[PDB]
Amino acid sequence: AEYQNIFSQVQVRGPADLGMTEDVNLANRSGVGPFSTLLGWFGNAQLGPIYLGSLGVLSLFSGLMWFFTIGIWFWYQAGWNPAVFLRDLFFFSLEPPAPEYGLSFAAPLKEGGLWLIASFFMFVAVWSWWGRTYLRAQALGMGKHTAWAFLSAIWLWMVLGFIRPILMGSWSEAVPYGIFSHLDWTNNFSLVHGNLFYNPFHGLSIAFLYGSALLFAMHGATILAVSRFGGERELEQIADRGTAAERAALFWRWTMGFNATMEGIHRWAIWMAVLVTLTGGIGILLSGTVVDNWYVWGQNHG
């Protein structure tokens, strides 16, 4: 059996890697976590450091507040009973205000107000975390590709919980906080809009979701197949093409008649992925605001 490079045969360790300085405020970096021999079979053993900073603290605190606001409501729904809590964990649901309250914040705690509070904490948690992806790249002198890609996910999120609700005229349109209940919301959204399979944007979203798996299967497999020539050192192969990048390209050229470069594949990658939530967000944003029934729309072809 030829060795396949899925798991490492031998792990090596040296001094904890504290990373590149550039313009990072080092006062804001933790120390190293433990080293996981377990992780080290597949990826990196080292844990940490992490970067704190005010935004990071805000984001994390705000994210926990969101999580705890949902848990508190869940405990209350369980009548404070530990055994009912665990039994019914996936059945609990923090639900948005009823249609009658419209977009007002005048709904009572137990009937929508707590949903708004949780949502508020999620809103600042996510956006402050976005600002974080930008600033961590900035301090390192890197491009802003991560923050830009992250904005595509944020787009779908924002459409589901904020933009579409505001446009529809009520918070009742937003997604509930619950395991099973978010799924029921999802099924019901489709049913009420005449079947999302007739939404051309849902269909594009799928093409890209499937597409992402095809592509990362392709890319990942390719790099591993040429890791015997240092293929995974992608940046030095961009700067100085080696036989890894050439065999990679030629595999695909011989197979399907065209190919990528070591840099360009990563451009196919980022776009295949961000287009999932980009088309997605549009498909959802248009639903109910402009198109009531996707089947109906599709019959007029538009």
Binding site: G43, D88, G141, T146, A217, L224
Partner: protein
């Protein structure tokens, strides 16, 4: 017809069948025995689909649909116009996909690379075969397979799902979806990371993999690393497809009721089944 670095790699050898018989290219395309097999299977398949379109009486690509034999035929042959064409097109498709993978193996051998790509592709083939061969055989009829039509294949997904209530409640479906979402998230991040290092702020030097480790550790306190991420993306996307095939091989065979009710086993556990309060008491 050749990339600037290509000629040194176009040596003889690596074929699985035929020696030097088909050891050649057509433009960029490698051929080999399995390039010939792929062409045969694909061409026959497309011819038969076109024949099916004539018998259906349309050339509209949004209307052409090739249906498997009705349930009453079970697992035997059907008249061409009533599911037999579907049967032959399925043999052709399988022929073509497997041929494609094997041609990929020939290309790997010529290029002296690992077999990872055709290995990964085999997962996709297996998922296809689950839907058109394994599950229908286990369920006793070809008619449970999906039809070959752009819109009709979507009717099938819908009707099949709702046969079990909200299909969201299939627990293997849930894992599958999680791998799909996680894969797309990792693709976005890998692509963004490499690009953010290769294309830094205006005027700055290319960043290093060290910068890539630094950025992710700064962000989340961990970095899988550069071999890790390509291992990751391969694992996530193959796992998504494995659990996709699992989620369906078990539907209509070992579980055939409403998937939502499967979750009752947890709630009906003796030690809390009967406690009042909550949603289920």
């Amino acid at each position: 017809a050749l990339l600037s670095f290509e000629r040194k790699y176009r040596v003889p050898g690596g074929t699985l069948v035929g020696g030097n018989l088909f050891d050649f290219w057509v433009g960029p395309f490698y051929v080999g025995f399995f390039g010939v097999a792929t062409f045969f299977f694909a061409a026959l398949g497309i011819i038969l689909i076109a024949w099916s379109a004539v018998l259906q009486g349309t050339w509209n690509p949004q209307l052409i649909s090739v249906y498997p034999p009705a349930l009453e035929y079970g697992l035997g042959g059907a008249p061409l116009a009533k599911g037999g064409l579907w049967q032959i097109i399925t043999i052709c498709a399988t022929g073509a996909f497997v041929s494609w993978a094997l041609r990929e193996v020939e290309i790997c051998r010529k290029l002296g690379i690992g077999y990872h790509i055709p290995f990964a592709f085999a997962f996709a083939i297996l998922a296809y075969l689950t839907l058109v061969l394994f599950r229908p055989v286990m369920m006793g009829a070809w008619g449970y397979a999906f039809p070959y039509g752009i819109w009709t294949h979507l009717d099938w997904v819908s009707n099949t799902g709702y046969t079990y209530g909200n299909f969201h409640y299939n627990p293997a479906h849930m894992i599958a979806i999680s791998f799909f979402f996680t894969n797309a998230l990792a693709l976005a991040l890998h692509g963004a990371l490499v690009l953010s290092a290769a294309n830094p702020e205006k005027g700055k030097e290319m960043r290093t993999p060290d910068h890539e480790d630094t950025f992710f550790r700064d962000l989340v306190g961990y970095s899988i690393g550069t071999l890790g991420i390509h291992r990751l993306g391969l694992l996530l996307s193959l796992s998504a497809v494995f659990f996709s095939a699992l989620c369906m091989i078990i539907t209509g065979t070992i579980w055939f009721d409403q998937w939502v009710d499967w979750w009752q086993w947890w709630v009906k556990l003796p030690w809390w089944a009967n406690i009042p309060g909550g949603i289920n008491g």
